[PDB]
């Protein structure tokens, strides 16, 4: 179906303990492929997928150089922002950056984005039109003005509508076995007493890829969000994912309740009664 | 806004001598490079600096020296000149992480000759050759030529001046001086240029034509003990007047 | 070698399209440039391209095909002042080296509507003991050559521009120091037209 290539960047300052920690992570869809950590041994961008080790020395020298550049702009950004808000020299602050592109099922450009955060709230983001910036407060207005110097229009566009889509396409053929698979969720249902009048119905999905899945509760037609307890979709560690949803049931009525699972790996959407 | 500047444009040195080439940059660029350019090898990178205070070696660093004490200036030292450091040197500057148009901009260059002995340094002799009667009688046009000859190093600038003002509008000068004896490293140089005017503009004897050669050599400072005249930086001119035929 | 370029010298007549190709070898390259260099001067930047397709600025058009690793540059309707060497330049990022081609040397030869090739002798206005042969008003199909023995110097062909008739003319100069030489003999090392006019 649709695909994505995303890079996530975290910078955290360490007042009186040196240079900020810097962490960069690459993803195609939900599969991680590269990493850099400013604390690790190598001081290089490192492979985290089988299919990307086949890139030559110049890729790795390239990516290493570019992420070292990324680290450096973030170092300066921590000091700029500490200046921008007049915060004291003695607190740890966080900068997160995320960019990349979405392609459709034809592998053509669909959407590009570049998000920025300071201390966990939105700082500046790139609008859909890829020329213009949403700035959060007065201090980000100065960054907006700076980044709306005339020449940037071209640069943004060039990466997100061009290079990002070029290389995501390259990666998707390079690991066809890894990235272009759909893994169907293995469905499963477990029932317990929890109150001797009440029963907990927990609905399961193990071993699926990609992570986007929808579990919802329903009693003989009309749906439920009131008694619904979703957990976060969680990695199994083998490259597939796991998720559960639960409802607190007036017991004796676990016949007229169906779990409903939607996944793109599913042919038909799965319906599970408790039997 | 003023861009990359670089001083001096021309230099002669003898073997052993030290000089620094200045380079400066108006634009708050973090990233400054030094190159040499040579007839068979194109641009080659000597040293470079990705920010203030930090520098590193390029592909051809040997014999050269660099510091970036401010973001504006990138001086290149040559601490002992060798004849193989005869080249055109280009300073260059690009934004780095500083933000601007991604473009690297080059300085106007420094042309350096390193000579074994500076008894090799000669100024040009300049002569103006007057148009043939034939050409005037065959085309109604008249070409003056200028010869600049026997100079070393090839560090000259030629310009024509008619009636006091500089002309550009009939001239062609050779793009590069020619070696007078292509077998020597000592070899002195020659340069030709052409000024063509109309016949009624040449045959007026009111019209004064002057060929000007600015030459770059030694300074007035320099130790000099030949009975030949000291070959300093100097302008050598030749002239002709309209012949009323 | 990183940036492979058109070797040269490429010869084009005025009004014509000059087409410079350039190939590079880092797959991850992201910024692409054209520089123009006049002889004796510094490389001046004229075209920056970043995405696939055509970019047009004036009489220049640069193209980019990242898929075949190729940067080109068309110079449409060539001016006389287009005569230079054109340097192709390629980089991967802010901190990556700017990789340069060797340059292709482009010559724009003038429209000379009706030539008459001729060799004249010039005496000077003084006493600087040599004399000059001027081969002039010839075709842009015409080369001038240079050997003999070392006493006779010939310069390469250059173009002048009289902006009052729209008259342009090529010329080349030969001289010797101490000599027994003449002008209807000084360009015997070259190919010279059948109607080359040696007067008086």
């Amino acid at each position: 179906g649709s695909h994505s290539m995303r890079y996530f960047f975290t910078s955290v300052s360490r007042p009186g303990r040196g240079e900020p920690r810097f962490i960069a992570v690459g993803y195609v869809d939900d599969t991680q492929f590269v990493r850099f950590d400013s604390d690790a041994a190598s001081q290089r961008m490192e492979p985290r997928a089988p299919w990307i080790e086949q890139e030559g020395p110049e890729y790795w020298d390239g990516e290493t150089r570019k992420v070292k550049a990324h680290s450096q702009t973030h170092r300066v950004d921590l000091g700029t922002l500490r200046g921008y808000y007049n915060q004291s020299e003695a607190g740890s602050h966080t900068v997160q950056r995320m960019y990349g592109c979405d392609v459709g099922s034809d592998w053509r450009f669909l959407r590009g984005y570049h998000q920025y955060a300071y201390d966990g709230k939105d700082y500046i983001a790139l609008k859909e039109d890829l020329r213009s910036w949403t700035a959060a407060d007065m201090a980000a207005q100065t960054t907006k003005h700076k980044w709306e110097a005339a020449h940037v229009a071209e640069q943004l566009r060039a990466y997100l509508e061009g290079t990002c889509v070029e290389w995501l396409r390259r990666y998707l053929e390079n690991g066809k076995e890894t990235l272009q698979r759909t893994d169907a969720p293995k469905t499963h249902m477990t029932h317990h007493a929890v109150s001797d009048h009440e029963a907990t119905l927990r609905c399961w999905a193990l071993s699926f890829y990609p992570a986007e899945i929808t579990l919802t509760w329903q009693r003989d037609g009309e749906d439920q969000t009131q008694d619904t307890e979703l957990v976060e979709t969680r990695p199994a560690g083998d490259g597939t994912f796991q998720k559960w949803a639960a409802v607190v049931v007036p017991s004796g009525q676990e016949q007229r309740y169906t779990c409903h699972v939607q996944h793109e790996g599913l042919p038909k959407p799965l319906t599970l009664r408790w039997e | 806004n003023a861009g990359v500047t670089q001083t001096p444009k021309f230099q002669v040195l003898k073997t052993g001598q030290s000089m620094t080439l200045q380079c400066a940059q108006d634009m708050n660029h973090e990233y400054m490079s030094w190159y040499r350019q040579d007839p068979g090898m194109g641009l080659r990178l000597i040293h470079y600096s990705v920010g203030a205070g930090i520098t590193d070696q390029g592909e051809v660093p040997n014999g050269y020296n660099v510091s970036r004490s401010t973001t504006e200036d990138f001086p290149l030292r040559l601490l002992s000149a060798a004849p193989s450091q005869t080249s055109v040197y280009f300073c260059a500057s690009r934004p780095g992480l500083a933000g601007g148009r991604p473009e690297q901009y080059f300085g106007p260059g420094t042309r350096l000759t390193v000579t074994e002995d500076l008894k090799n340094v000669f100024p040009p002799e300049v002569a103006v050759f007057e148009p043939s009667e034939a050409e005037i009688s065959h085309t109604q046009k008249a070409t003056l030529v200028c010869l600049a000859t026997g100079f070393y190093p090839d560090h000259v600038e030629l310009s024509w001046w008619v009636n006091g003002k500089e002309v550009h509008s009939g001239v062609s000068t050779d793009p590069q001086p020619l070696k007078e004896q292509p077998a020597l490293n000592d070899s002195r140089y020659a340069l030709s240029s052409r000024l063509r005017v109309s016949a009624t503009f040449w045959q007026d004897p009111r019209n004064h034509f002057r060929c000007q050669v600015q030459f770059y050599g030694l300074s007035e400072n320099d130790e000099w003990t030949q009975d030949r005249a000291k070959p300093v930086t100097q302008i050598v001119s030749a002239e002709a007047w309209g012949r009323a035929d | 070698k990183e940036v492979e370029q058109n070797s040269g010298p490429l010869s084009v007549p005025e009004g014509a399209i000059a087409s410079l190709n350039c190939t590079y070898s880092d797959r991850g390259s992201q910024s692409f440039f054209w520089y123009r260099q006049y002889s004796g001067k510094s490389p001046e930047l004229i075209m920056s391209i970043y995405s696939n397709g055509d970019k047009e600025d004036g009489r220049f058009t640069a193209q980019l095909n990242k898929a075949s690793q190729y940067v080109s540059l068309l110079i449409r309707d060539s001016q006389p002042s287009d005569s230079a060497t054109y340097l192709c330049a390629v980089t991967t990022d802010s901190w990556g080296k700017l990789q340069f081609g060797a340059g292709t040397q482009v010559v724009v030869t003038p429209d000379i509507q009706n030539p008459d090739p001729a060799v004249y002798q010039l005496r000077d206005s003084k006493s600087s003991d040599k004399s000059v042969c001027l081969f002039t008003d010839f075709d842009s199909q015409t080369n001038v050559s240079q050997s003999k023995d070392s006493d006779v110097y010939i310069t390469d062909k250059t173009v002048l521009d009289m902006r009052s008739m729209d008259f342009k003319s090529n010329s080349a100069v030969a001289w010797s120091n101490k000599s027994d030489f003449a002008c209807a003999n000084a360009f015997n090392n070259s190919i010279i037209p059948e109607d080359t006019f040696f007067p008086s």
Binding site: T80, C164 | - | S31
Partner: peptide
């Protein structure tokens, strides 16, 4: 592949 241009905040 990472983006080879970035501008300070």
């Amino acid at each position: 592949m990472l983006w080879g241009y970035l501008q300070y905040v």
